[PDB]
């Protein structure tokens, strides 16, 4: 199994992660489980998902990493939440369709795939974040904001005033905020302004790992910046410097360190949210 | 040469045009020529290009057409204009990178490719249209707005208030407006508001052709709507119902019917613009 990045002919000088990377970090079936919720939430609040509308990430050598939102990271936690009784809505800054890292799609998962198929339109024809934000008030029916990981979360989200307003609303209004892997990079939207996440702790994909993955061809080059240290400059605490599939809780801020943490984050979020709404 | 659409593995159920389509409508070298401008424009006005930030177009059968801006259509006219002394700037509604139909890129063109390479950053890191519009005034240094074709021009542009404001500025301020193929679909941004293009005539890709190309696999399905008739409802006149590589002029509105018209549109635009600015 080669460690060389693979060609994405759709774009100019763009690559998918190497075969080795894929054999070691993806699988045709997920580790989705523990989906037992006999007493589901019966209210109206939904999960607001802020997804990636861009697939290509430029690396330090000019090459583009063909990324986007991680399917395992996005789907598992929503599967648990949907099962727990929480439906979801999807939004992107531009309003353009969600861009997934399909090379990580568990195409043979007899549960995840049909769940994906039955909500495909929500991802394909998302709402424009700004439109959602304009209607926000203390009574808005969103029980939580979910920012899934995938390197696509590094594009736009970390510098969007819309994401900032959104996060500000959620925190100020005592709502849940869920994220994993690189999803917390969006929290950087709060720099230069009121930062209600100051002093919060989370786990996430460590910058240290991003400096190693290209060695195995997960990406065609190095990142041009690291969200970990920036978040630390923004007054946030990152508790891990490695990948173990762990999850963490700081009040209503629920996070995960990687796709290996997706199933666990689902359980944690479902458990925490059910208890709050019942 | 097969007439079956080809798979774009980067996306879910997305396809590039068939081999047949490509053998008959693309080429490793363009028909770029007649680039003779001994007395180039020596002012500051630039060409403002409004490009596509989305590559995937949903068809009537749920399948996605892997499109974007047509490289021949985009590059040839800018090559002539740049040669004529007019540099250019690129903007997209979202600010995300320009998405090209690389399957039409003349990868062996010893002129177009280097010209592309030397301006790549303008396409990759475009300005956000709204930002450009906010700074617009009668003295703004844009001699023309260029909306290249490609089916990607059908996404977002036809319903963007930013594009409407932009076109309104150009017309009201006696600037040139250039477009071809599906690029004029962006003119539909003017519906529901002041429409300074009412009564204008142009040539463009005929709806009739869009209803045939899928038969040869250029697209994986049929369009969900046709910009031709809408433009007609908006008070515009489309002079052609076929593809001949022709170009047309209506005051400062310069257009083309397809990629076969790109080289000619370049000459026309360069000629017309030089005469106006000198
Ligand atoms: Zn559902
Ligand atoms: Zn130049």
Contact status of A61 with chain B (Cβ, < 8 Å): no
- How distant, in Å, are the alpha carbons of A234, A273, B26, B113 from that of A149? 19, 20, 38, 36
- How distant, in Å, are the alpha carbons of A18, A164, A169, B148 from that of A133? 39, 10, 9, 32
State which fold the B1-278 domain adopts: Rossmann fold (3.40.50)
Per the annotation, where are the binding residues of A for Zn(2+)?
82, 87, 119
B128-139: string of b/e by CB count within 10 Å (b at 16+)?
bbbebbeebeee
Contact A23, B116 (CB under 8 A): no
Contact status of A97 with chain B (Cβ, < 8 Å): yes
Contact status of A53 with chain B (Cβ, < 8 Å): yes
Per CB-CB distance under 8 Å, the chain A contacts of B96 are 53-54, 94, 96, 155-156
Contact A60, A220 (CB under 8 A): no
B203 catalytically annotated? no
If you measure from the C-alpha of residue B83 to the centroid of ligand 2, how many angstroms do you get, rounded to a whole number? 9
Contact A152, A239 (CB under 8 A): no
| CB-defined contacts A:B, below 8 A | 51
Under an 8 A CB cutoff, do A12 and B100 touch? Answer: yes
Pairing mode of beta strands A176-180, A201-202: unpaired
Q: For residue B52, with 0-12 CB atoms within 10 Å meaning exposed, 13-18 middle and 19 or more buried, which class applies? A: buried
Measured between CB atoms, which of B8, B12, B54 is closest to A10? B8
What is the phi/psi pair of residue A212, to 5°? -110, -40
- Resolution of this model in Å is 2.2
Measured between CB atoms, which of A8, A58, A96 is closest to B53? A96
Could you tell me where the DSSP H helices lie in chain A? 19-25, 71-83, 112-117, 120-124, 129-134, 161-172, 207-210, 227-233, 262-276
Pairing mode of beta strands A46-50, A88-92: parallel
Report d(CA A249, CA A235) in Å as an integer.
17
Per CB-CB distance under 8 Å, the chain A contacts of B95 are 156
String of DSSP letters for A77-98: HHHHHHHTT--EEEEESS-PPP
How far does A239 lie from chain B, in Å, by closest CA?
32
DSSP state at residue A28: S
- How distant, in Å, are the alpha carbons of A180, A231, A233 from that of A164? 17, 14, 17
Report d(CA A89, CA A78) in Å as an integer.
10
């Amino acid at each position: 199994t080669s460690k060389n990045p693979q060609v994405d002919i759709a774009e100019d000088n763009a690559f998918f992660p190497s075969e080795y990377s894929l054999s070691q970090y993806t699988s045709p079936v997920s580790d989705l489980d523990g989906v037992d919720y006999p007493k589901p939430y019966r209210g109206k609040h939904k999960i607001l998902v802020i997804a990636a509308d861009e697939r290509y990430l430029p690396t330090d050598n000019g090459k583009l990493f063909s990324t986007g939102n991680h399917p395992i990271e996005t789907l598992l936690p929503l599967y648990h939440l949907h099962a727990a009784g929480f439906e979801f809505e999807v939004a992107t800054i531009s309003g353009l369709m969600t861009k997934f890292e399909y090379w990580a799609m568990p195409h043979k998962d007899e549960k995840v795939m049909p769940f994906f198929e039955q909500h495909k339109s929500l991802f394909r024809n998302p709402k424009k974040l700004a439109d959602v934000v304009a209607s926000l008030n203390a009574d808005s029916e969103y029980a939580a904001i979910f920012v899934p990981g995938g390197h696509g979360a590094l594009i736009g989200l970390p510098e969007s005033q819309d994401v900032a307003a959104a996060l500000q609303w959620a925190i100020k209004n005592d709502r849940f905020v869920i994220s994993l892997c690189h999803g917390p990079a969006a929290f950087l939207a709060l720099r230069h302004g009121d930062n209600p996440l100051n002093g919060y702790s989370i786990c996430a994909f460590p910058d240290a790992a991003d400096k190693q993955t290209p060695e195995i061809g997960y990406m065609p080059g190095h990142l041009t910046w690291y969200f970990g240290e920036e978040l630390k400059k923004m007054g946030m605490n990152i508790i891990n410097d490695d990948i173990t599939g762990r999850v963490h809780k700081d009040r209503k801020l629920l996070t995960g360190d990687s796709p290996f943490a997706a199933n666990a984050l689902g359980k944690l979020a479902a458990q925490e949210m059910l208890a709050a709404y019942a």
